Structures are given as structure tokens and as C-alpha cells.
């Protein structure tokens, strides 16, 4: 009679506390997956932003490339302040690329690499390793250490 | 008497 | 009287003189929570309107300029005290806003004729913050420890209790700075030790002589500069960009108002830059139009010019705290930990200081600027949650799992998982006609069957026959608490059941739960790639199957010689250097039609 | 003894069912606010990216006013380049910016907001109703609702008279 109440206030006591471990360890497992779930949307929100990104410095780039290094004297001062305000703004563009984590892909000279590096053409050049990047035509860039867009480079072919 | 995946 | 039943939401409101912050304790760690403009610190001023409005915030911030007699900004230094104070009369010169005293002789302000005690600001600014903290959480959040500076007498402390109380908050305790800090690093459950704290950054610098005697905090002395803060930094380093750019091209930025900004926001970013690099380059390009056209700024700093240019702010914090440690009656050879909390205390050269000045390195293990908001909620969540229940709730190790037919490791739980957990994956037969599945269930990181460990193995014995993929075997583990995984294969419409207590569940508890980690990081694109690879052999050989299966049912008038595709397949089957047999999977040709 | 530590140990379990009940409260409570706080970070959470690229924008606008567009003709062919270059990139990142939400903020005439304008000056102008923005010093930005800077109006003042 008596006997009975301590065995069943115990087995009562043993099934609910397992179930409320059961209760408090699942909300750590879903509270896990929303972290991660957060973090996934704002790393693809991210990558979404530095896909439309790339095409501003790629612009800029050119702009300021395609002017030669010769006529930027004193006599035209004109093109000699736009050219220093461009090349200052090129470099802010790539510092706070950087600090977010786009980083720049200009393996000048580096071993071909298919996660990084897209053979734009093959040609064979002198003093150069077979496979190796003597051109770069188009600039590529990184994310994260995964590739956001691949440099697009000229491969030395065998001759 | 390997087990599968279910896609 | 007994439990006060909270069973509610604490959260600890770092109520400061200028920037404010709220946190809440998310299971384990706390967190602090970002306002609707998405910063995390709330500026601490309540601006009044024409007609009647309570904007707090950024949006009382940019509206101080129109409305300069209404705008209620960094009040935290006239509560508590009477008009008749030397402190209060000193602040009331410079202070736009009209102070007035209250009937009871006290330090109030007053906006279109309407009394506001310096109580009702914070009240304000902590509704702010229980709106942030309501939307966040979801509900209402009742239960608050609000922080106060550790020279907050009793009177200041009952205010504060009073603004806490205003704003419809349950105001458990009132905390002091340097308590929640010592919180927030992790000095509660620690020994007899005598700490201090460094509290430089703000609008002022404090620092104070904790001893953690029986597990209780007792402040024992505090100091500190009072006109000495973070705002002085930049405010150098802006002159000495400032002066630098004159002296260079001979244009003073002082004239201007957006170049100024420029440099400011230049400047800050180059000091939280010269905490990390030696050097540092300042780049404003199109900062000033002149008549000979535009001028751009480029300057470089090197550290030690800026530890240089602000040697005299920092000497300046050498004197309070020699003074704090002669009032508290000890020496640097009975301190026994350096907490540093504030903006400014990244820099080495100030961590430097304060080595030379305890002899003690001291910890940086805790973000300085939310270290009072992380140490409230921590000692909220004790308080009055039940957060100690979830410390003792043990994590599994490494990660379950079983075998699949390709030889991958399906992953059922995975590596930080709480330990009383159930989960459930149903699985279907590897090939038709067959009867006897095993399970072999292993445990590890890698993507790979038998590289990782083998726990055990059991047979689940007996299935009617049917199809491949018909049939439907549910795989549950139902590891209960103290790491007992009750590994149970389950044959979904029939009998024939299996269960095992496997054991050895993190017995070994050791490094291995950091260096099996180690190396799996690094060993995971090719592990991954193994793994693709696998799994399109897997489903390359049951679509070739698939094909064989179906070519071997219609034979009559079946000109299928141009179906030789499976040719091919076993060909690229039999090549460890193509990427993947996805894109050659093209071979579920029916032009047979049964 | 027996009965009080029964008594006692009942009371315990009722407290641990209530606590259960609390348990599966808290759980439901993380789902909403976890779908809550996906969406916030999927519509928002390229706000530090775009607070720092505010300054690039506000660069290369300043540079394509900078030139008086007197000089640019085809006496000098390179100074033209450089400024169609500079033009096609000012328009690049503008619409890379709308791409994503971020709004310009230019209220010439608009109601003073606090909420998104920065007042300077509280300069009286004649003819313009108070209240209002006399000019605009700097172009503001937004995206989705949350500024991401305010744009630096100059409010009107009413006439001393």
C-alpha cells in the first residue's frame, strides 16, 4: 500500500527528469541550427553583394589602366589629379574589399590552379614552366578562401 | 548487406 | 520568504553616461543584442519635441542640432544628487539644457515647463532598452540587472532602483561595473585573489581593487581620471592629421565641416587599425576643393608615432590607480589577475602600461567594449534563470553515425551535440531481393566509413522480399543522459527489431576532442572529393542496373545495339580521374516502353 | 520521517513538470524567434559592406563633379576616357546599389525626419516653410528600412521678426 507510493514517486521522478533533459537538450540542438542557419543566409546575402561588386573595380580598373603612365605630367593637370584620385579610390575599393574578405587573385607567375585559375588560351612561352600563368587578361577574386569568381589566365603550353 | 541512403 | 518563482527573462542593461547596452543569456553564453538600426550600443540621450515626442537614441542624436535646449544628453552625472552640489554646479554652466531644483532639493532638468527628474531619463533610455530586449525575444521582458558605477552610493543606487522601476522592469539587483566585468571574464567561481580592474575607453577611466574572498566581490578601493576618455584619443590624432595636412599642401581642414568628418572617421579607423599592424595608411581622396584644384590626403603612421603623439593621455592613468592600489593596502605582488575593460585597452601599448604598473600580464580573453552588458547577463541568468542546468548537460564528443552501401558514413548526430537527445532516419534496402541488412555503427569526423573508428556491428535479420528502395528501415539512436547511446534499428512494417548498448561513448575523454578535429579540417576537400566520387560510382552503377534490368524485360525487335551507352559508363567507371559521373548519367533510356 | 520526505519529493516532481512545461515554452519561443531572425539577417545583413562602401560612392560622385566639363573635349583624348570611365563606374555602382535596396536619401524639400536626416545648421531661410530641408550637404543611404547613414540636411528656422 504505502510500499507502492515510493516505488511509483519514483519511477515518476526517473521518467520525468529523463523527459525534461529530453526537453532542455533539444532546444540547444534547435538553438545550434538557427545559428547556423543564420549565419548560412548572411554568407550567401554576402556573396550575392560581392558578385555585383567585382564589376565596379573591374571598371574603375580598366578606366584607370588604359591611361599611359607617359602623359601624366605637369603641363596636363587635369588628367594628373583625376588619375591620383582614381588610383587612391582603386585602393580604398581594394583595402575594404579586403578587410571584408574579397581578396584578389593575381597569380603573376604561380602554378595553374582549376579552383582559382581559368585557361583563357594555351601557348607555349619561353622561361616559362609548362602550366604555369605568364598573362593574366582578367583578374579574379576569392571569398572566404572559396572562389568567387576564377582568374581568367594564359597557360604555357609545351612547344 | 550494406545498408542504403534514401534520397 | 520562499522561491520568488521568476521563471521569466532577465536581461542586464548596461545603463552608461553616453552609450548604453542590453544582453540576454542565450543557454550557455550570453549575448548582446542590436538595436532596430542594427548597432549595439544605444546612445544614451532623450530629446523632447515642440508638441510632445520622447525620441531616444541615434534618432535624438541627429535632431540635437535643431532642438538644443531639449536634448537631455549624458544625465547619468546628476543623479543621486542634490542641487546644492559642487559637481552638479559645476556641470550646470556648460550644459545647454536648463537644471532646476526639485521641491525636495534635488538636481532636475525641465523641458516646456515640465519637471524631469535625472531618475526619469533612465527611465526612458530603459524603456528604450526593453523595447529592443521585447523585440528580440518576443515577449516581455520583466526581470533586469541594471549596472552602476562601483562609487554609486546608496542614495544613487535607490535612484537607479527607482529608474528601473519606472521603466516596468523587475529590477533584481543593481550591480556594480567592475563586478560585472570580473562576471563577464569568468572570476566568479575562482579563489581568494585580489584583482583590478581597467576601465579605460569611455568618458572616463575607473579602476578599481576587487577581492574574490568566499566567492562574494568586495571592492576594496577605486579611482580614476575623470576628464580623461576616448574622445581625447581622436581628438589628438585628428590634430595631428590635421596639422600634418596643413603643413604639407596649406589648407586647414578646421574651415571645413565634411572634411573633417572624413578625417575623423579616417582617424578612427587608423587607431582600431594600430592595434593589430605596426603601420597604417590614411587614404582621403578628394578631401578639399581648392582653386588650384582638388587635394588629396595620403599620409602613413607608423605605431610608435601614435603611441607617441598620446603618451601623455595614457601616463596620465599612472597616478589614480598607484593611489587605488596604496587605499586598497596592497601591492603589485598581491594582485592576482589584471582585468582590462574599455575601447582603448587594445592597444599594447596601454596593455604595456598596465603590465608595468601590476606586474601581472593582463587577460584579454573578453570584448572590453561589452564586457559590463556580458557580466550582467551572466549574473542575471544566474540570479533568477536556470542556466547552471544547462552547464551540467554534457555534450556528445565526436560524431555517430552508420554505414552506407557505398561505403559513405551517414551522419545521424553530429559532432556538439547535447547528449539526451533521439533522432531518426529511415533507410531502404541496398538491392532487390535481398533479405539481410547490417549495421555497422562507427564513430568520427571523416566522410568515410572505416577511417575514422567502429564502435560495433549488429544484423538486423529478416526481410520480405521486394523491390530496391521499397522497402523501409528506420535507424534510431536514443542516446539517453550520462552518455549511454541506445543504438536501435528499426524495420518499418514488420517485426524482426534490433538494439545495442554500445559503450566506450566518450570514455576516453581526452585531446582527442581537439586534435581529431585538428587534422579532419585539413583532410576535408579530398575527403569531400572521395566522397562525390563514391557517390557517383553509387549512382552510376544503380542507373546501369536500372538500364540492364529494364533491356532485359523487352527483348523482341529490340535493335538496341546503339544502346550500348553502358558500354561507356563502365568504362569511365573504371577511371580514378574524371571529376564525376553525374554529368555522364544520361542512360535511362526507355524508348522500349516496358 | 517517510511521509514528510514524500511530501517533499512529490513537491519536487510537480516542480519538474512545471519546469518541463517551461522547457517546451522556451523551445517554442526559439522557433519563432529563430524564423524571425532568418528572415532579418537574409533582407539585411550586407550592412557592414555597404557602410563601408558608402565612402566609395560618395568619392566617385565627388570626382565626376570635379572636373569643370569645359576641358574635356577632343583636344585632350585621354583626360575624355578617363572621365567616360570614371561616369560609366559612378552609374555601375549605382545600380549595384538599388540592386540590393540601398535607397539614396536626398530630401531637398522633404520634412524633417530625425529618424534619417542629420541636422547641421538651423539656419533661417526666407520663403521655405519650417521644418523642411534648406539643402542637403550630403546624400544619405538606406536599405530596407534601416539607414545606414543620414543624410547631413540644414533645417529652416521661423523668422525672429
Not at chain 1, 2 to 19: D, G, H
Not at chain 3, 203 to 227: A, P
Not at chain 3, 438 to 443: D, G, N, W, Y
Not at chain 3, 581 to 589: A, K, M, V, W
Amino acid at each position: 500500500t504505502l510500499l507502492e507510493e515510493k516505488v511509483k514517486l519514483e519511477e515518476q521522478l526517473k521518467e520525468t527528469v529523463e523527459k525534461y533533459k529530453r526537453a532542455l537538450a533539444d532546444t540547444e540542438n534547435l538553438r545550434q541550427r538557427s545559428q547556423k542557419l543564420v549565419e548560412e543566409a548572411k554568407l550567401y546575402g554576402i556573396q550575392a553583394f560581392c558578385k555585383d561588386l567585382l564589376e565596379v573595380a573591374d571598371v574603375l580598373e580598366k578606366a584607370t589602366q588604359c591611361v599611359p603612365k607617359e602623359e601624366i605630367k605637369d603641363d596636363n593637370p587635369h588628367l594628373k589629379n583625376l588619375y591620383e584620385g582614381l588610383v587612391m579610390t582603386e585602393v580604398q575599393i581594394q583595402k575594404v574589399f579586403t578587410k571584408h574578405g574579397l581578396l584578389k587573385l593575381n597569380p603573376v607567375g604561380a602554378k595553374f590552379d582549376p579552383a582559382e585559375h581559368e585557361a583563357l588560351f594555351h601557348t607555349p612561352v619561353e622561361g616559362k614552366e609548362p602550366g604555369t600563368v605568364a598573362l593574366v587578361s582578367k583578374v579574379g577574386y576569392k571569398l572566404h578562401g572559396r572562389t568567387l569568381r576564377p582568374a581568367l589566365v594564359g597557360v604555357v603550353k609545351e612547344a | 548487406v550494406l545498408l542504403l541512403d534514401v534520397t | 520568504m520562499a522561491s520568488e518563482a521568476i521563471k521569466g527573462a532577465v536581461v542586464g542593461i548596461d545603463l552608461g553616461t553616453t552609450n548604453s547596452c542590453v544582453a540576454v543569456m542565450e543557454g550557455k553564453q550570453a549575448k548582446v543584442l542590436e538595436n532596430a538600426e542594427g548597432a549595439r550600443t544605444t546612445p544614451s540621450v532623450v530629446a523632447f519635441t515642440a508638441d510632445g515626442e520622447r525620441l531616444v537614441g541615434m534618432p535624438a542624436k541627429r535632431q540635437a542640432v535643431t532642438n538644443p535646449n531639449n536634448t537631455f544628453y549624458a544625465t547619468k552625472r546628476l543623479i543621486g544628487w542634490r542641487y546644492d552640489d559642487p559637481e552638479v554646479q559645476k556641470d550646470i554652466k556648460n550644459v545647454p539644457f536648463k537644471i532646476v531644483r526639485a521641491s525636495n532639493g534635488d538636481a532636475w532638468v525641465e523641458a516646456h515647463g515640465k519637471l524631469y527628474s535625472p531618475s526619469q531619463i533612465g527611465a526612458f533610455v530603459l524603456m528604450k532598452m526593453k523595447e529592443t530586449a521585447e523585440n528580440y525575444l518576443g515577449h516581455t521582458a520583466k526581470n533586469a540587472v541594471i549596472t552602476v558605477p562601483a562609487y554609486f552610493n546608496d542614495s544613487q543606487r535607490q535612484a537607479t532602483k527607482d529608474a528601473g522601476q519606472i521603466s516596468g522592469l523587475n529590477v533584481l539587483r543593481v550591480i556594480n561595473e567592475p563586478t560585472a566585468a570580473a562576471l563577464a571574464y569568468g572570476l566568479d567561481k575562482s579563489e581568494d585573489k585580489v584583482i583590478a580592474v581597467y576601465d579605460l575607453g569611455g568618458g572616463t577611466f575607473d579602476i578599481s581593487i576587487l577581492e574574490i574572498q568566499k566567492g562574494v566581490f568586495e571592492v576594496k578601493s577605486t579611482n580614476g581620471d575623470t576628464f580623461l576618455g576616448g574622445e581625447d584619443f581622436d581628438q589628438a590624432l585628428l590634430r595631428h592629421i590635421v596639422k600634418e595636412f596643413k603643413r604639407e599642401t596649406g589648407v586647414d581642414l578646421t574651415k571645413d565641416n565634411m572634411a573633417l568628418q572624413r578625417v575623423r572617421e579616417a582617424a578612427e579607423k587608423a587607431k582600431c587599425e594600430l592595434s593589430s599592424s605596426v603601420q597604417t595608411d590614411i587614404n582621403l581622396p578628394y578631401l578639399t576643393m581648392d582653386s588650384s584644384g582638388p587635394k588629396h590626403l595620403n599620409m602613413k603612421l607608423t605605431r610608435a608615432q601614435f603611441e607617441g603623439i598620446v603618451t601623455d593621455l595614457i601616463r596620465r592613468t599612472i597616478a589614480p590607480c598607484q593611489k587605488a592600489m596604496q587605499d586598497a593596502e596592497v601591492s603589485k605582488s598581491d594582485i592576482g589577475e589584471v582585468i582590462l575593460v574599455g575601447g582603448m585597452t587594445r592597444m599594447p601599448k596601454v596593455q604595456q602600461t598596465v603590465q608595468d604598473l601590476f606586474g601581472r600580464a593582463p587577460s584579454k580573453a573578453v570584448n572590453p567594449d561589452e564586457a559590463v552588458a556580458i557580466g550582467a547577463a551572466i549574473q542575471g541568468g544566474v540570479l533568477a534563470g536556470d542556466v547552471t542546468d544547462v552547464l551540467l548537460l554534457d555534450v556528445t564528443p565526436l560524431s555517430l553515425g552508420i554505414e552506407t552501401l557505398g561505403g559513405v558514413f551517414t551522419k545521424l548526430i553530429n559532432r556538439n551535440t547535447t547528449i539526451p537527445t533521439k533522432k531518426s532516419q529511415v533507410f531502404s534496402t541496398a538491392a532487390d531481393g535481398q533479405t539481410q541488412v547490417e549495421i555497422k555503427v562507427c564513430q568520427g569526423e571523416r566522410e568515410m566509413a572505416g577511417d575514422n573508428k567502429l564502435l560495433g556491428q549488429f544484423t538486423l535479420i529478416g526481410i520480405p522480399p521486394a523491390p530496391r528502395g521499397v522497402p523501409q528501415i528506420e535507424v534510431t539512436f536514443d542516446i539517453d543522459a550520462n552518455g549511454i547511446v541506445h543504438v536501435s534499428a528499426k524495420d518499418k512494417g514488420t517485426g524482426r527489431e534490433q538494439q545495442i548498448v554500445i559503450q566506450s561513448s566518450g570514455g576516453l575523454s581526452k585531446d582527442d576532442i581537439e586534435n581529431m578535429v585538428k587534422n579532419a579540417e585539413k583532410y576535408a576537400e579530398e575527403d569531400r572529393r572521395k566522397k562525390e566520387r563514391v557517390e557517383a560510382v553509387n549512382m552510376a552503377e544503380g542507373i546501369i542496373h536500372d538500364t540492364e534490368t529494364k533491356m532485359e524485360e523487352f527483348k523482341d525487335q529490340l535493335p538496341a545495339d546503339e544502346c550500348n551507352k553502358l558500354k561507356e559508363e563502365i568504362s569511365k567507371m573504371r577511371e580514378l580521374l574524371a571529376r564525376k559521373d553525374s554529368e555522364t548519367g544520361e542512360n535511362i533510356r526507355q524508348a522500349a516502353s516496358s
